[PDB]
Amino acid sequence: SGFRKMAFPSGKVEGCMVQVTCGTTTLNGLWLDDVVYCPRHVICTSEDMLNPNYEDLLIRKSNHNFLVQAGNVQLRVIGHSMQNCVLKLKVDTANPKTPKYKFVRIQPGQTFSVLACYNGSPSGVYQCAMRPNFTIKGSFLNGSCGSVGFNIDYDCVSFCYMHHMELPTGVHAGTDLEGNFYGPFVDRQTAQAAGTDTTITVNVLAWLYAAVINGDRWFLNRFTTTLNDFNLVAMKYNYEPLTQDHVDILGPLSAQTGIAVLDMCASLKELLQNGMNGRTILGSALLEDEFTPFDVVRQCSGV
Amino acid sequence: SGFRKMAFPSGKVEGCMVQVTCGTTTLNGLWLDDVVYCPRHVICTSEDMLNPNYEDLLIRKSNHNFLVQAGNVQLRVIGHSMQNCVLKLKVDTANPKTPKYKFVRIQPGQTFSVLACYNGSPSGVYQCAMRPNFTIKGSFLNGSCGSVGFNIDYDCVSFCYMHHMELPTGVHAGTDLEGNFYGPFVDRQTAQAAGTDTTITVNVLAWLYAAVINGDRWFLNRFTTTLNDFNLVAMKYNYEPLTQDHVDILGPLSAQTGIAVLDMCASLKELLQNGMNGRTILGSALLEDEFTPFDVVRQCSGV
Ligand SMILES: *[C@H](O)[C@H](C[C@@H]1CCNC1=O)NC(=O)[C@H](CC(C)C)NC(=O)OCc1ccccc1Cl
Numbered sequence: 001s002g003f004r005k006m007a008f009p010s011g012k013v014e015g016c017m018v019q020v021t022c023g024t025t026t027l028n029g030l031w032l033d034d035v036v037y038c039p040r041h042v043i044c045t046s047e048d049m050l051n052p053n054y055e056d057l058l059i060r061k062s063n064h065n066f067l068v069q070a071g072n073v074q075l076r077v078i079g080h081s082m083q084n085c086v087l088k089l090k091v092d093t094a095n096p097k098t099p100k101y102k103f104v105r106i107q108p109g110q111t112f113s114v115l116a117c118y119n120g121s122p123s124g125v126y127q128c129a130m131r132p133n134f135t136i137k138g139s140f141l142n143g144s145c146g147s148v149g150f151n152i153d154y155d156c157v158s159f160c161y162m163h164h165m166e167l168p169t170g171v172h173a174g175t176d177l178e179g180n181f182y183g184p185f186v187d188r189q190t191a192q193a194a195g196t197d198t199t200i201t202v203n204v205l206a207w208l209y210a211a212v213i214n215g216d217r218w219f220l221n222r223f224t225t226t227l228n229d230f231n232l233v234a235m236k237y238n239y240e241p242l243t244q245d246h247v248d249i250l251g252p253l254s255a256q257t258g259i260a261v262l263d264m265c266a267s268l269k270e271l272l273q274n275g276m277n278g279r280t281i282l283g284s285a286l287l288e289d290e291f292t293p294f295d296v297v298r299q300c301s302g303v
Numbered sequence: 304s305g306f307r308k309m310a311f312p313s314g315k316v317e318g319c320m321v322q323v324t325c326g327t328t329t330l331n332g333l334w335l336d337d338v339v340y341c342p343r344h345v346i347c348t349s350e351d352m353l354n355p356n357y358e359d360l361l362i363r364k365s366n367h368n369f370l371v372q373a374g375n376v377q378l379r380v381i382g383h384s385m386q387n388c389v390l391k392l393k394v395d396t397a398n399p400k401t402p403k404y405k406f407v408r409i410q411p412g413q414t415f416s417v418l419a420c421y422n423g424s425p426s427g428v429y430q431c432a433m434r435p436n437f438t439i440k441g442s443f444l445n446g447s448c449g450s451v452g453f454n455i456d457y458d459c460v461s462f463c464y465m466h467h468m469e470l471p472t473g474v475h476a477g478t479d480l481e482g483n484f485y486g487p488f489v490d491r492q493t494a495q496a497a498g499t500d501t502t503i504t505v506n507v508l509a510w511l512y513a514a515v516i517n518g519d520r521w522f523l524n525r526f527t528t529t530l531n532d533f534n535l536v537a538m539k540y541n542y543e544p545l546t547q548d549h550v551d552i553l554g555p556l557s558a559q560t561g562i563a564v565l566d567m568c569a570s571l572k573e574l575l576q577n578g579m580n581g582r583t584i585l586g587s588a589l590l591e592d593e594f595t596p597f598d599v600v601r602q603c604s605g606v
């Protein structure tokens with residue numbers, strides 16, 4: 001028992017992190033087979049960074065412009081290309097620690113683990129949710145670009161995020177591993193705003209189910225509501241609408257607890273209208289929306 | 304920028320996790336050099352578990368009673384001994400992935416990363432604080448015993464925790480890697496209660512400094528108080544007393560923000576008396592005490 005925000009063990013990804021240097025800029029790269037992937041803005045200089053023409057910048061580079069370092073061993077670059085906002089550096093050595101992997105793009109509301117890295121060296125691991133506005137609430141300092149986000153599924157690493165930038169609100173933006181940004185962001189030193197965000201309703205309900213499984217029951221009630229009536233409450237509090245497929249995804253949790261989804265929605269309605277009255281749920285005094293139904297099932301099956 | 308509860312990258316510990324089986328009981332072990340460490344209650348049966356005599360139980364075992372498995376490779380046990388509540392199984396192969404390591408016992412209020420494991424296979428990673436009452440608030444299911452807690456410091460892994468049990472309140476208890484319990488707990492199937500807990504004051508103040516560094520300033524005020532006057536407020540709200548050494552540990556954070564510790568204590572005093580009035584600090588609606596000053600400095604130096 002217990003419920004904790006939990007990252008995937010990071011070992012398989014740690015074995016893939018390298019350091020990529022171009023000029024005076026150094027960031028992280030991801031070394032899979034004989035290709036290193038990193039943010040293309042490593043080829044920027046202090047003048048280009050406001051609005052650089054990356055095709056021009058890459059044409060003016062040669063393989064020897066790129067210093068790649070796998071710990072102490074220097075890797076020899078034998079080719080370079082651009083794929084959207086990611087640079088691909090072909091190297092003369094296949095990474096012997098390459099796991100089984102996929103490049104996957106995730107949906108808003110889904111979670112992944114971030115391995116924060118600096119100078120090719122992993123520093124920490126934590127869980128992030130892709131917000132509805134395509135930002136993540138991370139912890140990134142200078143030198144963290146090229147850190148990746150991932151999920152693990154039977155020894156296969158599904159990479160879904162590479163870090164590129166921070167926004168003025170302190171949230172973070174990046175690309176998939178094909179180099180395509182999540183959200184309407186671009187890789188240059190401009191003041192970019194994320195769209196308005198919303199709360200991930202299905203995740204809040206999953207977390208309420210986690211709470212029941214772990215013994216927090218004070219917010220439950222005898223009431224049940226309808227899908228249409230709940231979605232009216234959801235719009236008023238800036239929550240996403242609940243779909244029938246969401247009810248179906250929550251099926252296993254509703255089954256394990258014996259609490260119908262629309263029974264739990266009545267509890268959420270009262271929580272939104274009344275607050276918590278000084279009480280906590282799973283150690284929080286606000287409603288948490290960064291746990292997926294999958295995340296909850298992962299920790300709550302044996303309880 | 305951003306501030307997130309962050310675990311250490313788990314790769315060095317992942318390479319040490321094995322599965323230990325004795326009879327029908329299976330849990331995790333920690334394989335360092337040619338010794339595997341695991342909870343001694345793996346040698347219990349369904350009848351002994353209420354109050355077993357472990358010296359008797361181990362005398363009645365032989366090396367072939369222990370099935371050790373490093374993934375698919377079976378490890379041959381060539382010796383066994385007991386050290387307090389930990390069993391030490393000597394094996395015929397030194398773990399080639401053994402990191403530089405220490406066995407360290409941590410103090411209440413300090414944090415560590417937990418690598419949750421099942422059947423020798425790592426499942427997730429998260430951060431825990433040792434509570435003043437020597438429990439941790441983890442996430443552990445059946446089969447998780449032998450999972451370890453650790454910190455990493457320049458490629459040296461300091462192991463500080465091995466998991467043994469869950470208490471009726473849903474919190475967790477275990478030993479150091481010498482097999483000595485944290486707290487007044489024993490490894491048997493009895494209903495054990497933890498002592499009353501208290502809030503780790505120095506950690507709350509460190510987290511308030513993290514908040515300022517990240518731009519949360521609404522709780523600040525022009526007031527300053529004295530150490531003696533703050534500690535009177537601390538006792539009323541079940542907070543630990545603040546010592547001069549705590550003020551000194553917070554020195555770097557006070558320096559970086561230009562906010563004296565006793566200036567921040569005045570803010571904490573008002574927060575304790577008035578609450579938050581619907582506002583949040585670093586995404587929380589309660590005062591967080593599981594971040595050490597060290598944890599904060601790790602994420603807040605570049606900001
Ligand atoms: C890459 O390492 C870096 C990550 C930033 C640095 C601070 N926190 C982060 O997440 N990306 C950038 O610096 C990015 C470069 C442009 C894409 C060319 N710019 C950016 O994020 O602008 C904001 C910024 C830049 C420097 C320091 C702090 C901040 Cl907020």
Ligand SMILES: *[C@H](O)[C@H](C[C@@H]1CCNC1=O)NC(=O)[C@H](CC(C)C)NC(=O)OCc1ccccc1Cl
Nearest residue numbers: 001344443444445446447448467468469490491492
């Ligand atoms: C070891 O794997 C196990 C870890 C428990 C299992 C559920 N959550 C945990 O943290 N330890 C024990 O089962 C321990 C054995 C005795 C030390 C001999 N007993 C225990 O924790 O009692 C409580 C218990 C036991 C089984 C299931 C649930 C719970 Cl709460």
